[PDB]
Coordinates of C-alpha atoms and ligand atoms in Angstrom, one line a residue:
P85 CA -6.9 27.0 11.9
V86 CA -3.0 26.8 11.5
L87 CA -0.7 25.2 13.9
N88 CA 1.9 27.2 15.7
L89 CA 4.9 24.6 15.8
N90 CA 6.2 27.0 18.6
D91 CA 3.4 26.0 20.8
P92 CA 4.3 22.8 22.6
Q93 CA 0.6 22.2 23.9
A94 CA -0.8 22.7 20.2
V95 CA 1.5 20.7 18.6
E96 CA 1.2 17.8 21.2
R97 CA -2.6 17.9 20.7
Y98 CA -1.9 18.0 16.6
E99 CA 0.6 15.0 16.9
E100 CA -2.0 13.1 19.2
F101 CA -4.6 13.5 16.7
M102 CA -2.4 12.2 13.7
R103 CA -0.9 9.4 15.7
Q104 CA -4.2 8.0 16.8
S105 CA -6.3 8.7 14.0
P106 CA -7.1 5.6 11.7
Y107 CA -6.3 8.0 8.6
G108 CA -2.8 8.7 10.2
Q109 CA 0.1 8.9 7.7
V110 CA 3.8 9.2 8.7
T111 CA 4.3 11.8 5.8
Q112 CA 1.5 13.9 7.4
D113 CA 3.2 13.3 10.9
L114 CA 5.2 16.6 12.1
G115 CA 8.4 14.6 11.8
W116 CA 8.3 14.3 8.3
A117 CA 8.9 18.4 8.1
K118 CA 12.2 17.6 9.7
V119 CA 13.1 15.1 7.0
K120 CA 12.3 17.3 4.3
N121 CA 14.2 20.0 6.1
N122 CA 14.5 22.1 3.1
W123 CA 10.7 22.7 2.5
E124 CA 8.6 24.9 4.5
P125 CA 5.8 23.3 6.7
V126 CA 2.6 24.8 7.1
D127 CA 0.1 22.9 8.9
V128 CA -3.6 23.4 9.7
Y129 CA -6.8 21.6 11.1
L130 CA -10.4 21.9 11.8
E131 CA -12.3 21.4 15.1
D132 CA -15.3 19.7 15.7
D133 CA -18.1 21.2 17.9
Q134 CA -16.3 20.1 20.8
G135 CA -13.3 22.1 19.9
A136 CA -11.4 18.6 19.2
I137 CA -9.3 18.0 16.3
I138 CA -11.3 16.2 13.5
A139 CA -9.5 16.8 10.6
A140 CA -6.0 18.0 10.0
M141 CA -3.4 18.5 7.1
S142 CA 0.4 18.8 7.2
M143 CA 1.6 21.0 3.9
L144 CA 5.2 21.3 3.1
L145 CA 5.9 24.0 0.6
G146 CA 8.7 23.9 -2.2
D147 CA 10.1 26.3 -4.7
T148 CA 9.2 26.2 -8.3
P149 CA 10.6 28.1 -11.5
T150 CA 7.9 30.7 -11.1
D151 CA 7.4 33.2 -8.3
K152 CA 4.9 30.6 -6.7
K153 CA 5.4 27.9 -3.9
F154 CA 4.0 24.2 -4.5
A155 CA 2.1 23.2 -1.5
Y156 CA 1.9 19.4 -0.8
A157 CA 0.3 17.6 1.7
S158 CA 1.8 14.1 1.1
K159 CA -0.8 11.2 1.4
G160 CA -2.6 14.0 3.4
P161 CA -5.2 15.0 4.9
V162 CA -5.8 13.1 7.8
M163 CA -9.6 12.4 8.1
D164 CA -12.2 10.8 5.9
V165 CA -11.2 12.4 2.4
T166 CA -14.9 11.1 1.0
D167 CA -16.3 13.5 3.6
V168 CA -15.9 16.3 0.7
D169 CA -17.7 18.8 2.4
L170 CA -15.6 18.3 5.7
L171 CA -12.6 18.4 3.2
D172 CA -13.5 21.5 1.8
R173 CA -13.7 23.2 5.3
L174 CA -10.1 22.0 5.8
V175 CA -8.9 23.1 2.4
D176 CA -10.1 26.6 3.2
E177 CA -8.1 26.5 6.3
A178 CA -5.1 25.5 4.3
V179 CA -5.6 28.0 1.7
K180 CA -5.9 30.8 4.3
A181 CA -2.7 29.7 5.9
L182 CA -0.8 29.6 2.4
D183 CA -2.0 33.2 1.8
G184 CA -1.4 33.5 -1.6
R185 CA 2.2 32.1 -1.8
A186 CA 1.5 28.7 -3.4
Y187 CA -0.2 28.3 -7.2
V188 CA -1.5 24.6 -6.0
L189 CA -2.5 23.0 -2.9
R190 CA -1.8 19.1 -3.7
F191 CA -3.0 16.1 -1.6
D192 CA -2.7 12.4 -2.5
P193 CA -4.5 10.4 0.2
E194 CA -4.6 6.8 0.1
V195 CA -8.3 6.3 -0.5
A196 CA -9.7 4.1 -3.2
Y197 CA -10.1 5.6 -6.8
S198 CA -13.7 5.6 -8.1
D199 CA -15.5 7.6 -10.7
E200 CA -18.0 8.8 -8.0
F201 CA -15.5 10.1 -5.8
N202 CA -13.4 11.5 -8.4
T203 CA -16.5 13.4 -9.7
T204 CA -17.7 14.3 -6.2
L205 CA -14.3 16.1 -6.2
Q206 CA -14.4 17.7 -9.5
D207 CA -18.0 19.0 -8.7
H208 CA -16.5 20.6 -5.6
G209 CA -13.7 22.3 -7.9
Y210 CA -10.7 20.3 -7.4
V211 CA -8.6 19.3 -10.1
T212 CA -7.8 15.5 -10.0
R213 CA -5.0 13.5 -11.3
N214 CA -5.6 9.9 -11.9
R215 CA -6.5 7.9 -14.9
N216 CA -6.2 10.9 -16.9
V217 CA -2.7 11.5 -16.6
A218 CA 0.6 10.0 -17.8
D219 CA 1.6 6.9 -15.8
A220 CA 5.4 7.9 -15.7
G221 CA 7.5 11.0 -16.4
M222 CA 7.7 14.5 -15.2
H223 CA 3.7 15.0 -15.5
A224 CA 3.0 11.6 -13.6
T225 CA 1.6 11.8 -10.2
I226 CA 4.4 12.2 -7.6
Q227 CA 3.3 9.2 -5.4
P228 CA 2.4 5.7 -7.5
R229 CA -1.3 5.2 -7.3
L230 CA -1.3 1.4 -7.4
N231 CA 0.1 0.0 -4.3
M232 CA 0.4 -3.5 -3.1
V233 CA -1.2 -3.7 0.3
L234 CA -1.5 -6.6 2.5
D235 CA -4.5 -6.7 4.7
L236 CA -3.8 -8.5 7.4
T237 CA -7.3 -8.1 9.0
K238 CA -8.2 -11.0 6.5
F239 CA -6.1 -13.4 8.9
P240 CA -7.3 -12.8 12.5
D241 CA -5.3 -15.6 13.7
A242 CA -2.2 -15.4 11.6
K243 CA 0.7 -16.1 14.4
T244 CA 3.6 -15.9 11.5
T245 CA 4.4 -14.4 8.3
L246 CA 3.8 -17.9 6.7
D247 CA 0.4 -18.0 7.9
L248 CA -0.6 -15.6 5.1
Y249 CA 0.5 -17.5 2.4
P250 CA -0.3 -20.5 -0.1
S251 CA 2.3 -23.2 0.3
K252 CA 4.0 -22.3 -2.9
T253 CA 4.8 -18.7 -1.5
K254 CA 5.8 -20.4 2.2
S255 CA 8.2 -22.2 0.4
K256 CA 9.9 -19.0 -1.2
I257 CA 9.9 -17.4 2.1
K258 CA 11.7 -19.9 3.7
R259 CA 14.1 -20.5 1.2
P260 CA 16.7 -17.6 2.3
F261 CA 16.1 -18.6 6.0
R262 CA 16.9 -22.1 5.3
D263 CA 20.0 -20.9 3.5
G264 CA 21.5 -19.2 6.3
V265 CA 20.1 -15.8 5.7
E266 CA 19.6 -14.0 9.0
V267 CA 17.8 -10.7 9.8
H268 CA 18.3 -8.1 12.6
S269 CA 16.3 -4.9 13.1
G270 CA 16.7 -1.7 14.9
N271 CA 17.2 2.0 14.3
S272 CA 20.5 3.0 15.3
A273 CA 23.6 4.4 13.3
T274 CA 24.9 0.9 13.0
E275 CA 21.6 -0.3 11.1
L276 CA 21.6 2.9 8.9
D277 CA 25.0 2.3 7.8
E278 CA 24.3 -0.9 6.8
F279 CA 21.3 0.3 5.0
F280 CA 23.3 2.9 3.4
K281 CA 25.6 0.6 1.9
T282 CA 23.1 -1.9 0.4
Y283 CA 21.1 1.4 -1.0
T284 CA 24.1 3.2 -2.5
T285 CA 25.2 0.0 -3.9
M286 CA 21.7 -0.9 -5.1
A287 CA 21.7 3.0 -6.7
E288 CA 25.0 2.2 -8.4
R289 CA 23.8 -0.9 -9.8
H290 CA 20.9 0.7 -11.3
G291 CA 22.6 3.5 -12.6
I292 CA 20.1 5.8 -10.4
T293 CA 20.8 8.7 -8.0
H294 CA 20.4 8.2 -4.4
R295 CA 19.3 10.3 -1.5
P296 CA 22.1 11.4 1.2
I297 CA 22.4 9.7 4.2
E298 CA 21.6 13.0 6.1
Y299 CA 17.8 12.3 4.8
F300 CA 17.6 9.0 6.6
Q301 CA 19.8 10.5 9.7
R302 CA 17.0 13.2 10.1
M303 CA 14.3 10.5 9.4
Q304 CA 16.0 8.4 12.4
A305 CA 16.2 11.5 14.7
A306 CA 12.6 12.3 13.9
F307 CA 11.2 8.9 14.5
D308 CA 11.6 6.4 17.4
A309 CA 12.5 2.7 17.1
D310 CA 8.7 1.5 17.4
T311 CA 7.9 4.0 14.5
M312 CA 10.9 3.7 12.2
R313 CA 13.1 0.1 11.7
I314 CA 15.9 -0.6 9.7
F315 CA 15.7 -4.6 8.7
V316 CA 19.3 -6.1 7.9
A317 CA 19.6 -9.4 6.1
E318 CA 22.9 -11.0 6.3
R319 CA 24.3 -14.2 5.8
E320 CA 27.4 -16.0 7.8
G321 CA 28.9 -12.3 8.0
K322 CA 27.8 -10.8 4.8
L323 CA 25.4 -7.9 4.2
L324 CA 23.1 -8.8 1.8
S325 CA 20.0 -6.7 1.8
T326 CA 18.2 -4.0 3.6
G327 CA 14.4 -2.5 3.9
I328 CA 13.1 0.6 5.8
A329 CA 9.8 0.3 7.6
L330 CA 7.5 2.7 9.0
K331 CA 4.8 1.9 11.3
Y332 CA 2.2 4.5 11.5
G333 CA -1.6 4.7 11.8
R334 CA -3.3 1.3 10.6
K335 CA -0.2 0.3 8.5
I336 CA 3.4 -0.7 8.4
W337 CA 4.9 1.1 5.1
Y338 CA 8.0 -0.6 3.5
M339 CA 9.7 2.7 2.4
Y340 CA 13.2 2.0 1.3
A341 CA 15.5 -1.2 0.5
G342 CA 18.9 -1.8 -0.9
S343 CA 20.8 -4.8 -2.0
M344 CA 24.3 -6.1 -2.7
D345 CA 25.4 -6.9 -5.9
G346 CA 25.9 -10.9 -6.6
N347 CA 24.4 -13.8 -4.7
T348 CA 21.8 -12.4 -2.1
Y349 CA 20.3 -15.8 -1.3
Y350 CA 16.4 -14.3 -1.6
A351 CA 17.5 -11.7 1.2
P352 CA 15.0 -9.3 0.2
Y353 CA 12.4 -12.0 0.8
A354 CA 13.8 -12.5 4.6
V355 CA 13.6 -8.8 4.9
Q356 CA 9.6 -8.6 3.9
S357 CA 9.1 -11.6 6.0
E358 CA 10.3 -9.9 9.3
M359 CA 8.6 -6.6 8.3
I360 CA 5.4 -8.4 8.1
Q361 CA 6.2 -10.2 11.3
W362 CA 6.6 -7.1 12.9
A363 CA 3.1 -6.0 11.6
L364 CA 1.6 -9.1 12.9
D365 CA 3.5 -8.7 16.3
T366 CA 2.2 -5.2 16.7
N367 CA -1.7 -6.1 15.5
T368 CA -1.2 -3.7 12.5
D369 CA -4.2 -3.9 9.9
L370 CA -2.2 -3.3 6.8
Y371 CA 1.3 -3.9 5.3
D372 CA 2.1 -1.7 2.5
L373 CA 4.8 -2.7 0.3
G374 CA 4.4 0.4 -1.8
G375 CA 3.8 1.2 -5.5
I376 CA 4.3 -0.8 -8.6
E377 CA 4.4 0.6 -12.3
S378 CA 1.8 -2.0 -13.6
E379 CA -0.1 -5.0 -12.4
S380 CA 2.2 -7.0 -14.9
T381 CA 4.8 -9.6 -14.7
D382 CA 6.7 -7.3 -16.7
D383 CA 7.1 -4.9 -13.9
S384 CA 9.9 -5.9 -11.4
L385 CA 8.4 -4.1 -8.4
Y386 CA 5.0 -6.4 -9.4
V387 CA 6.5 -9.4 -9.6
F388 CA 8.6 -8.9 -6.3
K389 CA 5.4 -7.3 -4.6
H390 CA 3.1 -9.7 -5.9
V391 CA 5.1 -12.6 -3.8
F392 CA 3.5 -11.3 -1.0
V393 CA 0.2 -9.4 -1.7
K394 CA -1.7 -11.9 -4.1
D395 CA -4.8 -9.3 -3.7
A396 CA -5.3 -6.8 -6.6
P397 CA -3.2 -3.8 -6.3
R398 CA -4.8 -0.8 -4.4
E399 CA -5.4 2.0 -6.8
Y400 CA -6.1 5.3 -5.1
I401 CA -7.6 8.8 -5.9
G402 CA -4.5 10.2 -7.0
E403 CA -3.4 14.0 -6.8
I404 CA -6.5 16.2 -5.8
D405 CA -5.4 19.7 -6.4
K406 CA -6.8 22.8 -5.2
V407 CA -6.0 25.3 -7.9
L408 CA -5.0 28.7 -6.6
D409 CA -3.1 30.2 -9.1
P410 CA -4.3 28.9 -12.5
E411 CA -2.0 30.5 -14.8
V412 CA 0.9 29.1 -13.2
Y413 CA -1.1 25.8 -12.4
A414 CA -1.6 25.3 -16.3
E415 CA 2.2 26.1 -16.7
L416 CA 3.5 23.5 -14.3
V417 CA 1.2 21.0 -14.4
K418 CA 0.1 19.3 -17.3
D419 CA -1.7 15.8 -18.2
Ligands
MG216 MG1 11.1 30.2 -7.5
MG217 MG1 -1.3 -10.1 16.2
MG218 MG1 -1.4 -11.7 0.1

């Protein structure tokens, strides 16, 4: 069925399912639609024989250069996507809800890539985008398929961040702190202003664009301090680096970062250490440092994230596309 966003009861049940599911994703939370306020939300779900929600998909519809919309369920749906027969049923609900307005319904769940799963999906009629598409560019997957994920369940007795690492790494993490770097965290306007300054500075330094502050303000309005937290690293009165982490489902996700120019005293390591400590303190299963371009030392993202994730990066199935308008799809989506 389709969720009536104006039905508080229905919304609460949908949210409860999302928040409690081991497959929950912040980008599938109804709060994500508030962040992506320029996209149209269309949410659907399936119920089991007891009438309880067993699967849900929060879609966001965006415009394209054609008469069709692009329907996207970021890191959704929320269910065991390998249960493809169940997935088909949920997608059928989504297709009904879209009512021919979209040329495609795409979802990129955080499930490991495998030839078997890839094949099963294709056998069910989905078009998958992973190893068959470009690594970067306008043809690449929206979300990086290679992600550096720290599995904290491998360290049941870990009390602090240092307990998860080899001595060489403990040294790297301790460095900023011994040099005076201090981290404070929260989700108020003050921390947001600190984040934004480092974020725009970082953007200007790398000659790249940055999202407007309103984007993050909507995020702050949508998520409480137990879900969204901004970590700010400073040294004796000087702002050095920041990071935004979102706690949801089985993980804490390092989503945004910023760092001032010049000497930052390895503040980014301090930020990571505190985000990981938050994951430990909350008994979270995973700490997701996000994507990398490649598992190579030539990738600055990899080198940095590899300090905190020694396991191989997780490689996801990529984009699973339910093609609705084949002609427009072929026009807008290519390898
Ligand atoms: Mg258009
Ligand atoms: Mg713990
Ligand atoms: Mg590790």
